[PDB]
Design an enzyme around this catalytic site. Structure first.
Site, PDB file in Angstrom:
ATOM      1  N   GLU A  60      97.807  33.996  21.240  1.00  0.00           N
ATOM      2  CA  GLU A  60      98.544  33.678  20.348  1.00  0.00           C
ATOM      3  C   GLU A  60      99.795  34.820  19.579  1.00  0.00           C
ATOM      4  O   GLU A  60     101.378  34.351  19.721  1.00  0.00           O
ATOM      5  CB  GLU A  60      97.982  32.888  18.793  1.00  0.00           C
ATOM      6  CG  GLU A  60      96.757  31.640  18.656  1.00  0.00           C
ATOM      7  CD  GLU A  60      96.655  31.583  17.509  1.00  0.00           C
ATOM      8  OE1 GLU A  60      96.705  31.816  16.473  1.00  0.00           O
ATOM      9  OE2 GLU A  60      95.412  30.566  17.827  1.00  0.00           O
ATOM     10  N   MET A  61      99.688  35.627  20.591  1.00  0.00           N
ATOM     11  CA  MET A  61     100.928  36.256  20.730  1.00  0.00           C
ATOM     12  C   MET A  61     101.872  36.106  22.044  1.00  0.00           C
ATOM     13  O   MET A  61     103.555  36.202  21.778  1.00  0.00           O
ATOM     14  CB  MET A  61     100.667  37.835  22.218  1.00  0.00           C
ATOM     15  CG  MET A  61      99.426  38.782  20.074  1.00  0.00           C
ATOM     16  SD  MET A  61      98.527  39.966  21.460  1.00  0.00           S
ATOM     17  CE  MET A  61      97.833  40.768  19.704  1.00  0.00           C
TER      18      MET A  61
END
Ligand code: HEC
Ligand code: HEC
Ligand code: HEC
Ligand code: HEC
Ligand SMILES: [Ca+2]
Ligand SMILES: [Ca+2]
Lengths: 303, 305
Positions: free
Chosen positions: B107-108
């Protein structure tokens, strides 16, 4: 007060408001359903044992038995503030599946029998549609644990005399209790029994075992959770095995050479006095009225 | 002698064998898939960044940058033995799963469903997912990507640090100065927070190092955050230090940890002995074959920038 300020660094008071669970939002009907499930002994295969049997809200969220490998039932009160979820295990397993609700259920039931039993009780499916609107098949095990979790989140004990002391009133506890606190800090107890829950934050290679009861681990790959000490005065007996009945003996065992810490009997008494200040206000829980079986509800199985 | 028996109490050496993952059984093809995905930059939206970029097997499983709120990248080496999964958070949230570290890392740089669609557009991937997760109609899923990676991660352990040879009985495996560092580490109370098989990563504490070469100090988190006390294995090679990566030198991180706020003072001489001990915690670095990755098809999504 240095002691007060040091306490305010290591601990925080239990909030009155139930904490929000991310990904599990509380709503009246979900909290209601969670309460029903908690007291419904039909979640056990024998139909005699509910969560309240081992986590009795009238007895500090535990059952005042040693065990029910057998383990002492930890309190449900403020369990929502525990980071470490289990008494003990190997590092890799506590790292990498089942949470405490599911584990507890499997002690005396199979998930699939539980869900098929709930479905056979005509009052339950409509309550699950209200609590989980939108889903075509809302009676599932994951939803059972969600409903129970939003109810458990209301099982908090704000307003212990120690919490009043944390919020600024030096007089909320006696000065003997303050001496026990000072001793609790200086002796090193607080390193492991820290934060909003005064423990439950981590694991340590430190179990209490027999051979008399003593702190130890040999080079053994199991680690034990350092528990929250909230309400410890009313959740006897003590330690993962529930083998040690008196709080004072518990305090004395924890004064082990193996964790630093030397303590006199006089020190112990002051520490106990301080631990007695951690009993919060106990939730007043209404016993729910449960919907009746149908003719198709599965029969009890004695075990 | 005695210092040894105490160390054997608190710490446990890293097993050479990858640990078994409950419900995530290792198999050759699942391990191979996990290695491919770990080095495949197409798991990021830019197609430039892989797990190896921030957790580089060449550089102690981290990336030797401060940050990539932004956090320093913890090593993947032995991460399979961390109980505590994150740098920090509130108690009730760490208690819950907002997803694990694999999903959160992804998700970064990407969205999970874009990741999955990208893997399905790469013709050589679906069959490998079929071999790795037999009996499943649709085996290319986000959960299966994490499972493949995790059994690959489970091979990224570092046995045989000199300190582990000492745990196993041999007092000569570390220098007598290391041994004085060890004695200090125990006596000053460091080992309660950095204990067990991973020498930390077992719990959260209401202490973080914050902006106060001693501009940085341990301060309490009376807000409601707690910080993971990390594993100190391979610490000599995973600089910079602390959750924000702001302290570059190990010896400075040690002095900072000599906090009165934790009931600890150490001399500068003390610091140096402890550093010497910490240098004994570097294990054998895994030798990882860089994978040959299957090529895009014409329908593989474009990189974004
Ligand atoms: C009804 C379904 C429930 C619910 C909602 C919970 N319990 Fe139990 N429980 C029991 C024991 C021995 C343990 C300790 C297990 C171990 O660590 O090895 C537990 C643990 C829990 C927890 C964890 C609390 C915490 O410290 O964070 C929770 C939240 C939990 N349970 C909820 C014992 C029993 C029983 C004895 C036979 C029964 C019945 C249940 N539990 C049932 C339930
Ligand atoms: C300072 C001398 C203290 C005091 C007064 C207490 N503690 Fe600890 N604690 C630790 C662990 C891992 C456990 C569980 C052990 C087991 O279950 O086998 C404990 C347990 C306790 C209890 C029992 C409470 C209960 O609910 O059962 C009590 C009253 C207690 N502690 C008080 C971990 C640690 C530490 C980590 C290294 C340190 C230091 C201490 N405890 C110190 C003390
Ligand atoms: C590719 C998919 C991966 C994999 C398999 C992992 N990573 Fe990362 N990672 C990054 C940062 C800053 C953190 C710390 C986050 C925090 O705690 O706030 C992480 C954390 C992890 C972990 C947890 C390790 C542990 O200590 O137990 C793991 C197992 C993990 N990651 C695996 C930073 C990044 C990146 C920088 C941009 C990238 C790329 C990744 N990570 C990718 C992945
Ligand atoms: C005794 C003097 C020591 C020594 C030598 C070290 N520690 Fe700790 N440690 C703790 C926590 C919560 C952290 C993370 C804090 C943050 O990131 O803001 C740390 C960090 C370290 C490091 C950095 C390691 C890294 O990979 O970045 C080092 C080298 C270190 N420690 C050494 C927690 C605690 C404790 C909890 C109460 C105690 C006690 C200590 N540490 C003590 C020491
Ligand atoms: Ca008990
Ligand atoms: Ca680092």
């Amino acid at each position: 007060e240095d002691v007060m300020k040091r306490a305010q660094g290591l601990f925080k008071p239990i909030p009155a408001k139930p904490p929000v669970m991310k990904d599990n939002p509380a709503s009246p009907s979900r909290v209601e359903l969670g309460r029903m499930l908690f007291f419904d002994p039909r979640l056990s295969a024998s139909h005699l044992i509910s969560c309240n049997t081992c986590h009795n809200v009238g007895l500090g969220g535990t059952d005042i038995l040693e065990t029910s490998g057998p383990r002492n039932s930890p309190t449900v009160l403020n369990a929502v503030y525990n980071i470490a979820q289990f008494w003990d295990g190997r590092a890799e397993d506590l790292a990498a599946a089942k949470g405490p609700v599911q584990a507890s259920v499997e002690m005396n039931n199979k998930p699939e029998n539980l869900v098929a039993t709930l479905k056979s009780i005509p009052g339950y499916p409509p309550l699950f549609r209200k609590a989980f609107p939108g889903q075509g098949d809302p009676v599932t095990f994951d939803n059972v644990a969600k409903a129970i979790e939003v109810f458990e989140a209301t099982l908090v004990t704000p307003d212990a005399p120690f919490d009043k002391y944390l919020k600024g009133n030096r007089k909320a506890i006696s000065s003997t209790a303050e001496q026990g606190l000072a001793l609790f800090l200086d002796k090193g107890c607080a390193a492991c029994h820290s934060g909003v829950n005064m423990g439950g934050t981590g694991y340590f290679p430190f179990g209490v075992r027999e051979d008399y009861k003593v702190t130890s681990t040999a080079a053994d790959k199991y680690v034990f959770r350092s528990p929250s000490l909230r309400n410890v005065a009313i959740t006897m007996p003590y330690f993962h095995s529930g083998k040690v009945w008196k709080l004072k003996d518990a305090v004395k065992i924890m004064g082990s050479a193996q964790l630093g810490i030397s303590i006199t009997d006089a020190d112990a008494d002051k520490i106990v006095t301080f631990l007695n200040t951690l009993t919060g206000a106990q939730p007043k829980v209404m016993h729910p009225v449960l919907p009746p079986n149908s003719d198709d509800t599965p029969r009890p199985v004695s075990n």
